[PDB]
Design a binder for this molecule. Structure first.
Ligand SMILES: CCN(C[C@H]1O[C@@H](n2cc(C#Cc3cccnc3)c3c(N)ncnc32)[C@H](O)[C@@H]1O)S(=O)(=O)c1ccc(OC)c(C#N)c1
Ligand SMILES: [Zn+2]
Length: 264
């Protein structure tokens, strides 16, 4: 049992998440009321305290809270499927949009897409679809193809390849990948970043200091309120996807400085 605002692993919890954890546990287990600032820290810090630190901070429920956390760690909550679908779509659009802008691939080979739907429909690129089992109502614009590196490593060399949850034996070097370690040898892990080219708007909040917020307003280090809100929503989606066991990989020459250069 857990609120839908706590289903992520405690490592990703914010300081506000911890306070909600305390209030939820206060009601679920009929514990003595506890001040929210008793555990004024985020999740990664809360996981470093000892059971004794819990007892000192909360004499009346410290031991109980500690054991509750250990069960949450031993049996993690399952995320909502629709929420995870939305998160995955947001990440897919962000990453593929950025790669196309950064490196201006003339062609995208979407391998494992059975519905012929572009995740970045506005991009200036030739979009091609392949799938081993295309949907009957979209097969007329999908190449029926089971990708295997040993068979196709000399194909799809122009442009970039997208494998979104298409768990092939081994990815080509020019690929963008989401997968739920030998398969990735031609690639590198994709570090987190947020990119936006939408216009800034002034009406901040808690000021956002982050080198990974790639926005025009961040060139000067002062992120506008709109992009700060977008960044935080995107990070929540990214974390939800990472917590659910997905990992992102990319062609080795992917470079975020190419994204910064789009603002000049
Ligand atoms: C649209 C995404 N899907 C996958 C799509 O890729 C097609 N496909 C699969 C492939 C495979 C494989 C393989 C190779 C070695 C060993 N064993 C399996 C292959 C392929 N070689 N070439 C083209 N096309 C493919 C498939 O027809 C489908 O359309 S999925 O199945 O909905 C899905 C969703 C979420 C997931 O995880 C959260 C997972 C997982 N895991 C899968
Ligand atoms: Zn902005």
């Amino acid at each position: 049992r857990l609120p839908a605002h706590l289903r992520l692993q405690p490592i990703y919890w914010s300081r506000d998440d911890v306070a909600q954890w305390l209030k939820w546990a206060e009601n679920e287990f009929s514990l003595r009321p506890i001040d929210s600032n008793t555990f004024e820290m985020n999740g990664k810090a809360l996981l470093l305290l000892t059971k004794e630190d819990f007892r000192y901070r909360s004499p009346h429920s410290g031991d109980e809270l500690y054991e509750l956390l250990q069960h949450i760690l031993k049996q993690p909550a399952a995320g909502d499927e629709l929420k995870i679908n939305a998160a995955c779509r947001k990440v897919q659009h962000m990453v593929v949009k950025a790669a196309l802008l950064a490196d201006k691939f003339p062609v995208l080979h979407d391998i494992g897409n059975p519905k012929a739907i572009k995740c970045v429909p506005q991009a200036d690129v030739e979009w091609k679809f392949y799938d081993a089992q295309p949907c009957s109502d979209k097969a007329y614009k999908i190449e029926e193809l089971f990708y295997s590196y040993a068979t196709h490593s000399d194909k799809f060399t122009d442009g970039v390849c997208l494998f979104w949850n298409c768990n092939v034996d081994r990815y080509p070097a020019n690929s963008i990948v989401c997968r739920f370690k030998s398969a990735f040898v031609n690639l590198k892990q994709l570090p987190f970043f947020y990119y936006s080219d939408s216009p800034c708007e002034s009406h901040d909040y808690v000021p956002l200091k982050s080198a990974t917020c790639i926005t025009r307003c961040n060139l000067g280090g002062a992120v506008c309120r709109h992009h700060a809100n977008e960044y935080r929503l995107y990070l929540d989606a990214y974390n939800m996807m990472i917590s659910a066991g997905f990992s992102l990989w990319v062609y080795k020459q992917f470079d975020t400085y190419n994204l910064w250069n789009t603002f000049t």
